[PDB]
Amino acid sequence: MSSIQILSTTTIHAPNHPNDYSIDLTPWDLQYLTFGINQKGVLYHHPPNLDTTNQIQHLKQSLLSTLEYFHPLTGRLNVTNHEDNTVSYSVNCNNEGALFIHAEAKDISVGEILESTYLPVILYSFFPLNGVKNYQGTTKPLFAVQVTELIDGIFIGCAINHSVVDGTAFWYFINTWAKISKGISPVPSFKRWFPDSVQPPIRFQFPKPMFERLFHFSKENIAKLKSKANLEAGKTRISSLQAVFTHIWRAIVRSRSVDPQEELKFGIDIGVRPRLTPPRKNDYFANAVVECAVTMKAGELLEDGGLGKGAWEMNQKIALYNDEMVKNLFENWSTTPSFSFLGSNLADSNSVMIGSSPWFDVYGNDFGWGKPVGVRNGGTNKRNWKVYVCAGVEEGSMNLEVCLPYENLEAIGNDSEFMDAASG
Ligand SMILES: [Mg+2]
Numbered sequence: 001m002s003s004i005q006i007l008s009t010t011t012i013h014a015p016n017h018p019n020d021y022s023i024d025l026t027p028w029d030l031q032y033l034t035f036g037i038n039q040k041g042v043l044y045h046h047p048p049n050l051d052t053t054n055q056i057q058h059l060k061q062s063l064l065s066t067l068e069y070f071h072p073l074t075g076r077l078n079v080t081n082h083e084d085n086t087v088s089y090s091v092n093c094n095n096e097g098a099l100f101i102h103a104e105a106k107d108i109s110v111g112e113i114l115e116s117t118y119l120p121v122i123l124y125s126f127f128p129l130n131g132v133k134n135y136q137g138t139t140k141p142l143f144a145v146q147v148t149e150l151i152d153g154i155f156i157g158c159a160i161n162h163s164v165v166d167g168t169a170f171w172y173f174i175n176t177w178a179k180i181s182k183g184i185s186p187v188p189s190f191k192r193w194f195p196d197s198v199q200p201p202i203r204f205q206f207p208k209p210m211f212e213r214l215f216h217f218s219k220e221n222i223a224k225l226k227s228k229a230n231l232e233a234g235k236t237r238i239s240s241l242q243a244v245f246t247h248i249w250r251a252i253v254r255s256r257s258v259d260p261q262e263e264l265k266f267g268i269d270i271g272v273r274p275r276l277t278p279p280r281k282n283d284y285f286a287n288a289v290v291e292c293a294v295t296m297k298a299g300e301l302l303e304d305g306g307l308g309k310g311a312w313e314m315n316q317k318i319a320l321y322n323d324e325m326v327k328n329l330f331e332n333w334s335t336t337p338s339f340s341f342l343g344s345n346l347a348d349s350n351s352v353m354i355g356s357s358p359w360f361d362v363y364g365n366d367f368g369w370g371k372p373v374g375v376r377n378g379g380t381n382k383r384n385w386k387v388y389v390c391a392g393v394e395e396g397s398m399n400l401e402v403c404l405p406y407e408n409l410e411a412i413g414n415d416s417e418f419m420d421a422a423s424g
Pocket residue numbers: 124125130
């Protein structure tokens with residue numbers, strides 16, 4: 001039986017922190033107040049020859065210098081009640097503190113995590129601040145790192161309040177922390193983007209078991225799926241990612257053996273950084289993401305050519321999200337607030353959600369002992385019928401974390417059509 005023990009829990013602060021100051025939140029941040037905390041982690045193998053002397057200490061000290069540039073990670077959220085029955089939220093850069101947890105897991109190895117068909121559930125215990133919802137950030141920490149020691153490696157799992165960063169900002173922080181630990185770079189910015197049509201203090205009103213399998217998509221197989229989708233749909237602008245999304249969508253829906261006339265939903269995150277008044281990079285340390293939903297009937301998706309039809313439907317639905325579509329969602333949010341909710345582990349669902357991105361630099365995170373051999377999103381926001389996409393080790397490849405009931409994943413694993421362009 002895999003188990004985990006906490007070796008030490010300590011509070012950490014940003015060094016050379018100024019006086020207290022506040023940061024205002026956009027609806028991109030506020031929409032996640034009901035969501036679990038954002039969680040991402042990286043797995044490292046320790047070959048017998050590797051020298052890991054002083055590792056935990058160098059990881060912590062390099063983390064302290066990284067926090068010098070990310071003051072909000074040690075603050076707390078600040079809710080301001082309004083006599084309007086409404087609320088507003090800010091980030092108070094407190095230097096109040098973040099968590100640094102040193103832990104150890106027994107009877108679980110790097111190799112087991114890599115080779116097991118289904119993720120050992122103990123790995124979810126590698127992430128700190130589990131279960132926490134993001135509105136609890138007024139008193140609970142906004143940031144925590146857990147370094148868990150395995151018999152043949154370590155796992156570094158982070159948790160950052162999802163109303164503070166999205167995944168793009170999240171992996172920018174990890175990238176930076178790993179740069180510093182290896183042996184500076186431009187300075188990010190937490191100042192939020194506001195159109196002049198909205199005054200910052202935004203006010204609003206408030207409110208079967210899961211298995212996980214990792215399916216690999218080689219560079220070559222992605223190009224195959226991109227071609228097939230464009231060919232079948234008679235198009236050229238169906239992206240690599242849209243073709244993968246539709247390929248896994250077909251496998252999941254096939255495994256449900258549902259009715260061909262069933263109305264389906266496929267939810268995607270739309271990075272909106274290349275649509276701001278001045279464009280920004282992952283240097284923009286905040287949320288800049290909108291949720292879009294692609295609709296389709298099950299028979300349309302599963303019929304021959306449905307790879308092309310589903311992908312083109314994704315293509316066209318995304319295309320609707322230009323600068324003016326996003327600007328109006330932003331300003332209309334106060335009026336009609338939208339929130340990401342968790343829900344629980346349904347035995348069956350017409351909706352599939354996908355998150356993360358293959359453009360995150362997930363393997364370029366050498367702390368001084370090597371690049372990671374694995375990447376995982378945390379378990380707090382994982383439910384059945386959710387998928388997370390990251391790049392794989394191989395250049396141009398992708399890995400899909402697919403969270404579903406055991407028998408669905410088994411079916412998908414036996415699906416001749418799906419496994420023709422996927423392994424694992
Ligand atoms: Mg836990």
